[PDB]
């Protein structure tokens, strides 16, 4: 359970992300795909992209980054009371997209790295710890839904 102070750190940096949702979404997906190429293979939509320059040039990738970060921002702003938001997301990611929980750990690392690069003054160690806690809570609650549906592993 995050404290109120932890949530305030999380949402303070998140409000900075929302100044450039699409740039952050590109940076995060590109970091994910470069750091963990197995993740790119899960996207029929993107798996033709073979270089970082091609990834940066893809408008469709930039659009999907906005989709992802909009969904995540709506979850963070619930401060833990996010059951309604996680149901469809766990269902699609477990049963249609076939995304292991471990790949959610990978994208969480990419999000933290990009926030640290773009917002160092609002993403000191206290805020890094709080965002890690928030992303852990996200993964815990998604993993419980995966387990229900027979996909935790
Ligand atoms: C912060 C974590 C993530 C969030 C908030 C998120 C959110 C979303 C949303 C909102 C959609 C469209 C609606 C839906 O299908 O449910 C989507 C689609 C999808 N996501 Fe995620 N996602 C996350 C992580 C991942 C990861 C780590 C992967 C793969 C390694 C992945 C793979 C996919 C795929 C394959 C689609 C379908 C893309 C298409 O063909 O249109 N997601 N995601």
UniProtKB/Swiss-Prot annotation:
InterPro entries: Globin, Globin-like_sf, Myoglobin. GO terms for cellular component: extracellular exosome; sarcoplasm. The keyword Protein transport does not apply. Keywords: Cytoplasm, Heme, Iron, Metal-binding, Muscle protein, Oxidoreductase, Oxygen transport, Phosphoprotein, Transport. It catalyses: Fe(III)-heme b-[protein] + nitric oxide + H2O = Fe(II)-heme b-[protein] + nitrite + 2 H(+); H2O2 + AH2 = A + 2 H2O. The modification Phosphothreonine is found at residue 67. GO terms for biological process: removal of superoxide radicals. It is found in: Cytoplasm, Sarcoplasm. Monomeric heme protein which primary function is to store oxygen and facilitate its diffusion within muscle tissues. Reversibly binds oxygen through a pentacoordinated heme iron and enables its timely and efficient release as needed during periods of heightened demand. Depending on the oxidative conditions of tissues and cells, and in addition to its ability to bind oxygen, it also has a nitrite reductase activity whereby it regulates the production of bioactive nitric oxide. Belongs to the globin family. This is Myoglobin. It comes from Physeter macrocephalus.
């Amino acid at each position: 359970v995050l404290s109120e102070g932890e949530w305030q750190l999380v949402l303070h940096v998140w409000a900075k992300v929302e100044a450039d949702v699409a740039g952050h979404g590109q940076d995060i997906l590109i970091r994910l795909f470069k750091s963990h190429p197995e993740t790119l293979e899960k996207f029929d939509r993107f798996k033709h992209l073979k270089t970082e320059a091609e990834m940066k040039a893809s408008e469709d990738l930039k659009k999907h980054g906005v989709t992802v970060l909009t969904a995540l921002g709506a979850i963070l702003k619930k401060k833990g009371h996010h059951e309604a938001e996680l149901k469809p997301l766990a269902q699609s990611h477990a049963t249609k997209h076939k995304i292991p929980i471990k790949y959610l750990e990978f994208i969480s690392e990419a999000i933290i790295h990009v926030l640290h690069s773009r917002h160092p003054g609002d993403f000191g160690a206290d805020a890094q710890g709080a965002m890690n806690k928030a992303l852990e809570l996200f993964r815990k609650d998604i993993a419980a839904k995966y387990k229900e549906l027979g996909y935790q592993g």
